[PDB]
Amino acid sequence: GAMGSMERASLIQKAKLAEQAERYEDMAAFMKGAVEKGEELSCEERNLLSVAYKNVVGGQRAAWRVLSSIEQKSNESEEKGPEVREYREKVETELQGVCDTVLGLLDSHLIKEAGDAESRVFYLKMKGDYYRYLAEVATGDDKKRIIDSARSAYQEAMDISKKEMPPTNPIRLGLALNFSVFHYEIANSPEEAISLAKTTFDEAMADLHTLSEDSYKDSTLIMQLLRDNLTLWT
Amino acid sequence: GAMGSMERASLIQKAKLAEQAERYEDMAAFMKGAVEKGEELSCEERNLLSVAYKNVVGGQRAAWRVLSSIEQKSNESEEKGPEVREYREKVETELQGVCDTVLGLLDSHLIKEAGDAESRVFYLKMKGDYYRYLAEVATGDDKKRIIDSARSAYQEAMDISKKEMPPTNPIRLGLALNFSVFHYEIANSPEEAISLAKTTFDEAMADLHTLSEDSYKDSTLIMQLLRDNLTLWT
Amino acid sequence: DRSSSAPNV
Amino acid sequence: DRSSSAPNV
Ligand SMILES: *CC(=O)N1CC2(C1)CN(S(=O)(=O)c1ccc(Br)cc1)CCO2
Ligand SMILES: *CC(=O)N1CC2(C1)CN(S(=O)(=O)c1ccc(Br)cc1)CCO2
Ligand SMILES: [Cl-]
Ligand SMILES: [Cl-]
Ligand SMILES: [Mg+2]
Ligand SMILES: [Mg+2]
Ligand SMILES: [Mg+2]
Ligand SMILES: [Mg+2]
Numbered sequence: 001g002a003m004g005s006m007e008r009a010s011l012i013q014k015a016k017l018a019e020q021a022e023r024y025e026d027m028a029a030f031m032k033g034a035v036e037k038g039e040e041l042s043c044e045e046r047n048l049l050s051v052a053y054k055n056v057v058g059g060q061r062a063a064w065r066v067l068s069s070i071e072q073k074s075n076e077s078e079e080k081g082p083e084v085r086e087y088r089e090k091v092e093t094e095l096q097g098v099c100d101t102v103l104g105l106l107d108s109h110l111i112k113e114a115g116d117a118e119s120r121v122f123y124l125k126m127k128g129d130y131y132r133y134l135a136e137v138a139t140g141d142d143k144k145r146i147i148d149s150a151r152s153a154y155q156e157a158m159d160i161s162k163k164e165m166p167p168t169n170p171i172r173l174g175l176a177l178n179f180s181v182f183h184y185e186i187a188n189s190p191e192e193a194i195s196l197a198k199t200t201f202d203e204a205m206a207d208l209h210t211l212s213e214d215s216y217k218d219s220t221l222i223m224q225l226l227r228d229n230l231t232l233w234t
Numbered sequence: 235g236a237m238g239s240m241e242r243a244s245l246i247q248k249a250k251l252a253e254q255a256e257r258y259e260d261m262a263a264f265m266k267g268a269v270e271k272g273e274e275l276s277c278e279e280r281n282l283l284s285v286a287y288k289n290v291v292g293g294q295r296a297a298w299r300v301l302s303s304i305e306q307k308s309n310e311s312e313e314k315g316p317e318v319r320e321y322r323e324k325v326e327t328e329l330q331g332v333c334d335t336v337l338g339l340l341d342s343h344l345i346k347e348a349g350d351a352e353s354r355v356f357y358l359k360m361k362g363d364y365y366r367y368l369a370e371v372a373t374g375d376d377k378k379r380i381i382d383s384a385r386s387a388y389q390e391a392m393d394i395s396k397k398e399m400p401p402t403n404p405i406r407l408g409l410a411l412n413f414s415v416f417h418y419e420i421a422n423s424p425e426e427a428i429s430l431a432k433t434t435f436d437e438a439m440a441d442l443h444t445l446s447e448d449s450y451k452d453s454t455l456i457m458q459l460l461r462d463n464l465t466l467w468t
Numbered sequence: 469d470r471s472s473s474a475p476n477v
Numbered sequence: 478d479r480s481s482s483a484p485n486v
């Protein structure tokens with residue numbers, strides 16, 4: 001693509017620079033370029049890919065929510081014409097395009113080459129996450145299929161994580177957190193959400209004793225998010 | 235341009251929506267489209283134009299400063315190759331392009347049609363500001379000419395503001411603030427900066443008695459910024 | 469308020 | 478720290 005002439009190492013270096021400069025669109029383009037080199041990504045490089053796209057789509061999601069809220073208020077209200085809907089649709093399309101880009105990278109060919117637990121679970125979690133973001137804005141005949149695609153990716157990731165990783169592994173914990181959010185916010189399954197969050201928290205608690213000081217800090221940070229959700233949900 | 239098929243009123247409506255959604259690149263594109271309709275802008279519309287481009291260029295300036303700082307540190311240090319300079323140059327070029335876009339709108343044809351004091355001073359202040367942003371990154375044979383262009387725009391604005399507006403007018407105050415920043419940060423003229431800030435503050439103080447409660451709040455807000463700078467500078 | 473998903477790390 | 482210029486209003 002557009003980054004085809006830049007060295008892989010230069011793309012990673014520039015992604016790190018873009019991160020420091022809070023230039024997340026640039027960061028995502030650099031990391032897309034790096035993925036398109038065709039080599040597998042290290043843990044650090046997967047982190048850069050994740051941070052870049054999360055920030056890009058995060059801005060889009062926040063904007064979409066603002067616009068959807070204005071649109072819902074107008075449709076109850078003095079007629080304002082098509083502009084609110086048009087602009088919401090514009091932001092929605094751009095958001096869908098980012099999600100499709102990420103899903104395309106995962107499908108061509110990150111997931112299929114990912115054989116270690118940390119890589120495969122990370123990528124399948126990501127697949128679940130970006131289908132979940134598609135589901136947040138879906139309203140037509142594919143909302144159900146999008147939700148099922150998210151579910152299927154999260155489930156495959158969960159099955160591997162339970163077999164191959166300790167209950168305190170940050171990737172395993174972040175996956176379970178996000179799958180619980182999927183259940184609560186997308187799948188209309190609050191009880192499944194609560195059960196997953198509780199079981200995850202409890203199994204991690206029981207394994208903290210095995211960890212170093214640094215790993216303990218990492219795991220307990222994510223456990224606190226499970227607890228914050230459980231407080232919100234119960 | 236790209237917004238040529240959208241109604242002027244729809245462009246303004248969408249700029250307001252983009253502002254609420256914190257989508258400032260979109261906001262700037264909508265307002266550029268509105269300017270290109272060829273009609274003069276109201277006070278509110280000038281505000282939308284200003285907010286959109288200020289936020290866009292503000293992000294670029296912050297990124298450029300981060301990258302310039304990394305670059306200066308490397309050039310003293312283990313050789314890291316051309317990437318830091320390349321990426322700083324990329325951000326710099328994009329910043330220059332935004333400034334050139336704004337300056338082009340002012341030149342074609344906002345300034346020449348602006349006959350009232352509030353519009354003409356606002357646009358000439360803006361011209362000074364965007365030359366000032368160009369000056370922040372300039373290092374070659376045109377740094378002097380860029381600084382003089384900023385100075386000339388600010389001076390013309392100052393001359394009109396002193397003849398046509400009260401000393402508490404927010405546009406007059408914001409102009410004097412920014413011209414004082416020009417003197418201190420760009421023109422290596424800290425004494426001129428301090429003198430302008432002091433005289434501006436004092437003449438505004440003496441005119442506060444004429445104002446309503448709401449206008450008082452507006453003026454004193456900007457006066458506080460003059461005072462904050464004077465505290466920094468002395 | 470919405471549920472918290474995994475943050476950037 | 479840098480001088481303060483006019484903020485958004
Ligand atoms: C080592 C490795 O592959 N990575 C990717 C990660 C470190 C972890 N992921 S994540 O989405 O799995 C995640 C885990 C824990 C938290 Br609090 C947040 C996100 C993000 C990128 O870096
Ligand atoms: C009425 C009108 O033309 N405008 C433009 C403005 C209201 C004022 N400007 S400004 O750059 O002159 C400015 C004045 C005061 C402050 Br605290 C900040 C900026 C900004 C856009 O709105
Ligand atoms: Cl639109
Ligand atoms: Cl570059
Ligand atoms: Mg749509
Ligand atoms: Mg129950
Ligand atoms: Mg240059
Ligand atoms: Mg002196």
